[PDB]
Every structure is written in C-alpha cells, then in structure tokens.
Amino acid sequence: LKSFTVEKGIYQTSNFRVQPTESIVRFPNITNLCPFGEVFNATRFASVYAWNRKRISNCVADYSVLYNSASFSTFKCYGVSPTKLNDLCFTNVYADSFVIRGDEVRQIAPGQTGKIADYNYKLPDDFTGCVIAWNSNNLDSKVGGNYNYLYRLFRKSNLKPFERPLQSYGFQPTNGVGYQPYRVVVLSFELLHAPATVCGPKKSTNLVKNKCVNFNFNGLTGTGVLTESNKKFLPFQQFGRDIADTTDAVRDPQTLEILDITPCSFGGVSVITPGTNTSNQVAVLYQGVNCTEVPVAYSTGSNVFQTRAGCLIGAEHVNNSYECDIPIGAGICASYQTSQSIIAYTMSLGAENSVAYSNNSIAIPTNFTISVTTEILPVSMTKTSVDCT
C-alpha cells in the first residue's frame, strides 16, 4: 500500500505457488539398434583380412548393455558420450569385427602411425568410429597360437577408404603385456547419411503420486500433481488433452496405465486486517487454496479454518452470525471483537422479521418524520492533454 498506516479491510498481496518437490522420469524399454547389437558380444570374430562389416537393426541400441561391462578401459567417443547416447538417435552403425595383435589397437584409430594396419584395415579420412580397448586375450587365445589371422595382404595398388606385423607365430596367452591377442570393437557409424529409423536407449526412475513433482514421459516435460486415472485410453493413445488442448492425462510408458495430471495447487494471498491503530494483529487467507498446503511457507498456524473460498489463517471461526464487516467470499466476513481478536462468521443477512398479516388487519401510520439523506455523484474529471512529440 506504500503507506505506514493501512486501513480496515482486505488487501491483495503477492500470489502463492506450491513449489515443485522433486523430479520424476519415466521412459520405455528396448528400442531400435543402429549401434553394437552384437559386435561387442561374441566368442569368435571374423578374419583380419576379411574384416567384418555388419548392418545392425531394431533391437535395443543400448549402451546400458555395452557400457555396463567394466572390462573396457575407455569407451568415450570424441563427438558424443555413451552416457548421453540415451537421447541420441542413430541412422546406421557398422561393425568392425576381426582379430589383430595387442599392439595394433591404436593402429585402428584415425590417422594412425604404422603401415601394418593399412594392409589389413585401411583408415578412412572421415572415420567416426570410437576406439574401444577391451580385454580379449582369452577369446582368441590358442594352445599353440593361431596363424590363421595372418597379414599376407600386400597388394601393390593403393588402398581406399573402406573399399572392401606378423611378429608372432600366432596369438598365444603367454604373449607379454600388450602383446596378447586383442579384438577390435569400434562403432563405425554415419549420421544423416542414411535414413533415420532408429533411436538410442533410455533410463527410468521410480513412481510417486499426490505430490507437485516434475514429470517426464517420453519427453513430455512438465510440472503438476499426478494420480491414477480411471480414464480408459486407447491401445495406441498415450496423451490426453483438455478442451483448451492442455495435457491432463498421460500413460506410463513402462507399465500400461493412465495417470491424471493436475497443476500444482496455487492461489492468491489476501491479508485481512482492521485499522492499524485498532490492532496490529492480521488475518491472512489463501484464495481457493486449501490449507493442506499452507504449512509450506508463521507456517505453524495453530488457528486455521476452511472455507469454500479458501482456508484462512489467524482468525478464529465463530458459529454465530453478525453483520458483514469485511467481505471475504462465499458469504463470510471477518471483524475484530472480544481478548480482542479477529473472528469469522456467517452473513447475518438482517433482522429476521414476520409481518402480522391477516385478512382484516391494517397498520395505518399515526405519525411521520422528515429525514434528510445525502447523495453524491461524480460529475467530471480533470482534463488532460499529452504532447506526444
């Protein structure tokens, strides 16, 4: 009110909004494969000279089935991260399955040093694959050492990008540290070069109810209160909008069920108080806001009462009826009275009366009075002209 002395009445103030309590995330199960459906998983890989190339499709593109294993020393892509791979959607990934020497792992990296790799696996100028180092000695290990994984490829013609050393008798577990057989698992993939029909994996959280929480359902972010909904969605229907096209009903992606959505309870705050010098005690109420919430943020209360228009605070309910002193709503007004404290009552609509009607009864006035009653009316307001320029 910009004044040190407020008058008797009710005055609006800052609104009250229920704060979010936490966030909750729900997302679906197994999804579509571009990446490493099987390349990272097998007991036998293809030949080094016939380095494998697999097109992978339509199982879960899960790094939670690949990144879960702690065997890999480092799997962190230069351009992306496996942790953030959940949201990322791919177009196609190719599998480089073959067996090479333990010292030839980094030889698979782009711009490698050493011509041993080019003969068996040429490095493309635009490689997006991610070098992954995972223990693979036992899988390729042989009792006498396998020579089948030979590097006899010595074509004199130059080797192009994906157009299609032998210091050990074979791959033996007795080979020294770094000299053991190794298996290359690189997710060589292209994005937007092929049509997108795939997406990555996801993660889920727990479930809550009857709380103002932040919800994410298949990307459906928002804030509100969720509750089990008796509504019956269609088998292929997941979202529910109101007449004004506002989401009200959602279906849990993991467990089939429809949940209601309700905006977090809120409403205006109005302060009831008599004149300052009459008393410094004040009565505060929340408009259309139940006091099931009010202890959020004097929050103790100890003097509360629910009303159709709201659940006020600080005023003591009175079951008698008196003349309205300060309008509140739903036929409730508050006043300061006896020790003196603000009270709330119901409309004493007036002096109940019963005129003695009868068939042959007349009440003629025997006397009169002259009464002068004032009356005021606006006539004109101060004129005003504004010089635009």
Partner 1 sequence: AYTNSFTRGVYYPDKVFRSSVLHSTQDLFLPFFSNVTWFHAIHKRFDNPVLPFNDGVYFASTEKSNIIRGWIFGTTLDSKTQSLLIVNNATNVVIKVCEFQFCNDPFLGVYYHKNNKSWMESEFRVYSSANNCTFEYVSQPFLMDLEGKQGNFKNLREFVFKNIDGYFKIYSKHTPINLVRDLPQGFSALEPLVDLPIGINITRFQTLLALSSSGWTAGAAAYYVGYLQPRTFLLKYNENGTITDAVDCALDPLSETKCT
Partner 2 sequence: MYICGDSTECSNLLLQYGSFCTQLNRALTGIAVEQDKNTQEVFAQVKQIYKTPPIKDFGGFNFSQILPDPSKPSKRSFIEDLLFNKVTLCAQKFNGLTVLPPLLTDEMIAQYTSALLAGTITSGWTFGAGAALQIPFAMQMAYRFNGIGVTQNVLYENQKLIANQFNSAIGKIQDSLSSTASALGKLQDVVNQNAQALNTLVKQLSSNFGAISSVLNDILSRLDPPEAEVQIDRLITGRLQSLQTYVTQQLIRAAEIRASANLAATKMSECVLGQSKRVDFCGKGYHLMSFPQSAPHGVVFLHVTYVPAQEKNFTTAPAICHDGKAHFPREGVFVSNGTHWFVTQRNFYEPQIITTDNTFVSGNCDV
Ligand X SMILES: *[C@@H]1O[C@H](CO[C@@H]2O[C@@H](C)[C@@H](O)[C@@H](O)[C@@H]2O)[C@@H](O[C@@H]2O[C@H](CO)[C@@H](O)[C@H](O)[C@H]2NC(C)=O)[C@H](O)[C@H]1NC(C)=O
Ligand Y SMILES: *[C@@H]1O[C@H](CO)[C@@H](O[C@@H]2O[C@H](CO)[C@@H](O[C@@H]3O[C@H](CO)[C@@H](O)[C@H](O)[C@@H]3O)[C@H](O)[C@H]2NC(C)=O)[C@H](O)[C@H]1NC(C)=O
Of 88-96, 98-106, 293-301, 360-368, which segment contacts partner 2 by CB under 8 A? Answer: 360-368
Report the alpha-carbon distance of residue 118 to residue 154 in Å, rounded: 10
Q: Give me the 334-373 binding string for ligand X, x by CB under 6 A, dash otherwise.
A: ----------------------x----x-x----------
Distances, alpha carbon 12 to alpha carbons 2, 270, 324, 330, in Å = 13, 4, 19, 17
The distance of closest approach from Cβ of residue 358 to partner 2 in the complex, given in angstroms and rounded to an integer, is: 7
Nearer CB in complex with partner 2: 216/337: 216
Answer for the pair 342, 348: CB distance below 8 angstroms, yes or no.
no
| Binding partner selected for residue 255 from ligand Y, ligand X, ligand NAG, none, CB under the kind-specific 5 to 8 Å limit | ligand Y
The distance of closest approach from Cβ of residue 90 to partner 2 in the complex, given in angstroms and rounded to an integer, is: 20
255 binds ligand Y (CB under 6 A): yes
Residue count of the chain: 389
Structure tokens at 12: 């609006």
Strands 341-347 and 316-322, by their bridges, are parallel
Breaks in the chain, named by the residue before each, with C–N above 2.5 Å?
Answer: 164, 297, 338
Answer for the pair 55, 112: CB distance below 8 angstroms, yes or no.
no
Strands 212-217 and 247-251, by their bridges, are unpaired
Among 80, 194, 208, 264, binds partner 1 (CB under 8 A): 194
Strands 16-17 and 266-267, by their bridges, are antiparallel
| Binding partner selected for residue 3 from partner 2, ligand Y, partner 1, none, CB under the kind-specific 5 to 8 Å limit | none
321 binds ligand Y (CB under 6 A): no
| CB contact burial 289-319 (16+ within 10 A = b; e otherwise) | bebebbeeeeeeeeebbebebbbbbbbebee
Nearer CB in complex with partner 1: 56/105: 56
Among 290, 321, 340, 348, binds ligand Y (CB under 6 A): 290
Count Cβ atoms within 10 A of the Cβ of residue 334 and give its class: 0-12 exposed, 13-18 middle, 19 or more buried: buried
The distance of closest approach from Cβ of residue 369 to partner 2 in the complex, given in angstroms and rounded to an integer, is: 5
Residues 16-55 that bind partner 2 (CB under 8 A): 17, 20
Among 43, 74, 255, 380, binds ligand NAG (CB under 6 A): 43
Of 20-28, 41-49, 239-247, 279-287, which segment contacts ligand NAG by CB under 6 A? Answer: 41-49
Of 44-52, 233-241, 327-335, 355-363, which segment contacts partner 1 by CB under 8 A? Answer: 233-241
Residues 206-225 that bind partner 1 (CB under 8 A): none
Distances, alpha carbon 168 to alpha carbons 43, 154, 175, 258, 299, in Å = 21, 18, 9, 63, 78
Nearer CB in complex with partner 2: 178/327: 327
Among 13, 278, 279, 340, binds ligand NAG (CB under 6 A): 278
368 contact partners, CB below 8 Å, separation of at least 6:
none
| Binding partner selected for residue 193 from partner 1, ligand NAG, partner 2, none, CB under the kind-specific 5 to 8 Å limit | none
Q: Kindly state the helix (H) or strand (E) to which residue 118 belongs, with its residue range.
A: helix 116-120
Q: In terms of Cα–Cα distance, which of 196, 262, 251 is closest to 226?
A: 262
236 binds partner 1 (CB under 8 A): yes
- Contact positions vs ligand Y (CB under 6 A): 28-29, 254-255, 290-292, 306, 311
- Contact positions vs ligand X (CB under 6 A): 356, 361, 363
- Contact positions vs partner 1 (CB under 8 A): 55, 57-58, 92, 194-197, 231-241, 243, 249
